[PDB]
């Protein structure tokens, strides 16, 4: 499963452009589910500001992705059984990926939208960079006692030469 | 501020170098290029070449930077103007 | 005592996580849609969920569509992936 | 076409450096401005110790 | 493509002119703070040296 966010300018207005789009899409064939997506507009400045974000940004679509696929990785390690459940607990804002993407909503509590770009691109780093540093610290401790719980278990293993 | 830089290379070049202006500053360059009234020697080989002139013009020097990579990549020689 | 509040975390976690990754992407079209389009913006931020028997014909669709604007494309373009799970 | 293009990059360097200016001025304005309120301010106090201190003697 | 170059030109137009507004206003902006900062400086350096004499 997968979608894409697209943008383009209206004739006169915004609704112009996506009446053709979603149209083409759906009733053509079903090329795509189609529809407007949420976002706002946000504290705008010069070309030299724009230019760093867009490599800035860059570098922090691989970190955060980087920081999303982790945790997802670590629910696969703490669930060694209900492996098949792993898509019921990875969820976000209590439903599954294809719900949210669809239904997402810009939370203007935490990236309030009078402020800069800059300043709203430091808050999502900020953010998941604590993420980062508490699944360093979670599996720091995990890890090490799954190795001894299994040290334990590969003591008590085998016949009477090995248990 | 607003800034420019000129430079020449050999002509063939000119439009794979304005597509990629405009691929890595994302739709966003202005520049103008204009074709020498004779081909000019190369320095090394002695090859004249009908090189061509271009100029490109921006804000700031993140941009300068972006232009100057592209025509590093393209081996076009810059100058001061 | 571990595996509880780890699964508890790691579900805050990844919605947090994949909420600001959306951000992320949000402003990646947000400022891209500036630079290739100017200030006078009217933009509309649109979603699509490709279906998989037709994603090249959407593709080329989407190029007519979008033509007459200039991997590339001559509309702003970016995807999301579900298969974070492996 | 070229032409125009020219002359948006002359008068967009020049409508630049007028709003900069524009905007200097008013900052040197009100610069000025915030000194002479404060005097008028300065100016009532010292008149308040001086009764004060006719007041007292 | 002249009418891609008359895009460009329109384009280079509107991020000027935000620019020049973002300077603007960052200019503005340090003029109501050094405004309420020079005010408040004076008035208070010469109301103290009155009420030390006082």
């Given at each position: 499963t997968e979608f894409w966010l697209i943008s383009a300018p209206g004739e006169k207005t915004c609704q112009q452009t996506w009446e053709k789009l979603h149209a083409a899409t759906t009733k053509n064939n079903n090329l795509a589910v189609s529809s407007k997506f949420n976002i706002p507009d946000l504290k705008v400045g010069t070309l030299d500001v724009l230019v760093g974000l867009s490599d800035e940004l860059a570098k922090l679509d691989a970190f955060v992705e980087g920081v999303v696929k982790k945790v997802a990785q670590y629910m696969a390690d703490v669930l060694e059984d209900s492996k098949d459940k792993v898509q019921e607990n990875l969820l976000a804002s209590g439903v599954d990926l294809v719900t949210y993407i669809t239904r997402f909503q810009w939370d203007m509590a935490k990236y309030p939208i009078k402020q800069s770009l800059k300043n709203i691109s430091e808050i999502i780093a900020k953010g998941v960079t604590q993420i980062d540093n508490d699944l360093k610290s979670r599996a720091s401790a995990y890890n090490n006692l799954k190795g001894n719980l299994q040290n334990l278990e590969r003591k008590n293993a085998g016949s009477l030469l090995t248990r | 501020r607003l800034g420019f830089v000129a430079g020449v290379i050999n002509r063939e070049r000119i439009p794979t170098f304005e597509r990629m202006l405009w691929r890595v500053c994302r739709g966003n360059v202005f520049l103008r290029q204009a074709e020498i009234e004779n081909p000019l020697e190369d320095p090394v080989t002695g090859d004249y070449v009908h090189k061509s002139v271009f100029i490109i013009f921006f804000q700031g020097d993140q941009l300068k930077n972006r232009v100057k990579k592209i025509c590093e990549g393209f081996r076009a020689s810059l100058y001061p103007c | 005592?571990?595996?509880?509040?780890?699964?508890?975390?790691?579900?805050?976690?990844?919605?947090?996580?994949?909420?600001?990754?959306?951000?992320?992407?949000?402003?990646?079209?947000?400022?891209?849609?500036?630079?290739?389009?100017?200030?006078?913006?009217?933009?509309?931020?649109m979603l699509l969920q490709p279906n998989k028997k037709s994603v090249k014909k959407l593709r080329e669709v989407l190029h007519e569509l979008y033509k007459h604007l200039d991997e590339y494309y001559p509309y702003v373009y970016y995807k999301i992936d579900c298969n974070l799970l492996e | 076409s070229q032409s125009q293009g020219i002359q948006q990059l002359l008068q967009a360097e020049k409508r630049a450096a007028e709003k900069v200016s524009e905007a200097r001025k008013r900052k040197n304005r009100r610069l000025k401005q915030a000194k002479e309120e404060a005097q008028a301010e300065i100016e009532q106090y010292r008149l308040q110790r001086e009764k004060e201190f006719k007041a007292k003697e | 493509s002249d009418a891609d170059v008359q895009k460009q030109i329109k384009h280079m137009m509107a991020f000027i002119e935000q620019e020049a507004n973002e300077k603007a206003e960052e200019i503005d902006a340090k003029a109501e703070e050094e405004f309420n900062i020079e005010k408040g400086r004076l008035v208070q350096t010469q109301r103290l040296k009155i009420m030390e004499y006082y």
């Open positions: - | - | 005592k571990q595996f509880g509040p780890l699964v508890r975390w790691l579900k805050v976690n990844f919605s947090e996580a994949f909420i600001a990754w959306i951000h992320i992407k949000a402003l990646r079209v947000f400022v891209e849609s500036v630079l290739r389009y100017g200030l006078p913006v009217n933009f509309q931020a | - | -």
